[PDB]
């Protein structure tokens, strides 16, 4: 009889765990590699200082957290608890960046 939690309770525990915490979420090296991807795409032979990519990560995660707040609101609107594509497209339009 192994211990087995019901689905969602540990998810809520780590709701609290990652809201009371402040550390960065996206793994640093792949993220800065993706930033270098975009940079060399737009203009070749570009160099980055650490503070620049750290600020980029700050803004990126803030944007994603806000978008996820909005998508959670949208999902709650449809009497659902599982976020879905259409929630994301609705939020992305409604904030005004796609129209």
């Amino acid at each position: 009889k192994p211990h087995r939690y019901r689905p969602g309770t540990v998810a809520l525990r780590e709701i609290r765990r990652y809201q009371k915490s402040t550390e960065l979420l996206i793994r640093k090296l792949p993220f800065q590699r993706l930033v270098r991807e975009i940079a060399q795409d737009f203009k070749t032979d570009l160099r980055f200082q650490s503070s620049a990519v750290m600020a980029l990560q700050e803004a990126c995660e803030a944007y994603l957290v806000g978008l996820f707040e909005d998508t959670n609101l949208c999902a709650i609107h449809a009497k659902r608890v599982t976020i879905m594509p259409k929630d994301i497209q609705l939020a992305r339009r409604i904030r005004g960046e796609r129209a």
Binding site: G8, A11, L12, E14, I15, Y18, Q19, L25, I26, R27, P30, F31, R33, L34, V35, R36, E37, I38, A39, F42, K43, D45, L46, R47, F48, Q49, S51, A52, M54, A55, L56, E58, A59, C60, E61, A62, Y63, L64, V65, L67, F68, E69, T71, N72, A75, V81, T82, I83, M84, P85, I88, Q89, R92
Partner: protein, 82 residues
């Protein structure tokens, strides 16, 4: 030359970010869309930042130009100068 790096935004990273947003259950289709919107946001921000840097005849970008690019998008940020 390196490519196909959008997958660097891993599964549990997206799960943790959406979870910080108070989301419990995430459908399997969410992750590719999050990668796409993140890619678009990086494209815009990097475009503005590299424009700023190329203007100043500097071939290396700085956090000051990054935060200026954020501000110009109506996305000002605190904690790196300004």
């Amino acid at each position: 030359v390196l490519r196909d790096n959008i997958q660097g935004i891993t599964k549990p990273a997206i799960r943790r970010l959406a979870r910080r947003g108070g989301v419990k259950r995430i459908s399997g289709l969410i992750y590719e869309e999050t990668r796409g919107v993140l890619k678009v946001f990086l494209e815009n921000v990097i475009r503005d930042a590299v424009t700023y840097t190329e203007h100043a005849k500097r071939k290396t970008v700085t956090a000051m130009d990054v935060v200026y690019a954020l501000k110009r998008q109506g996305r000002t940020l605190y904690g790196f100068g300004g």
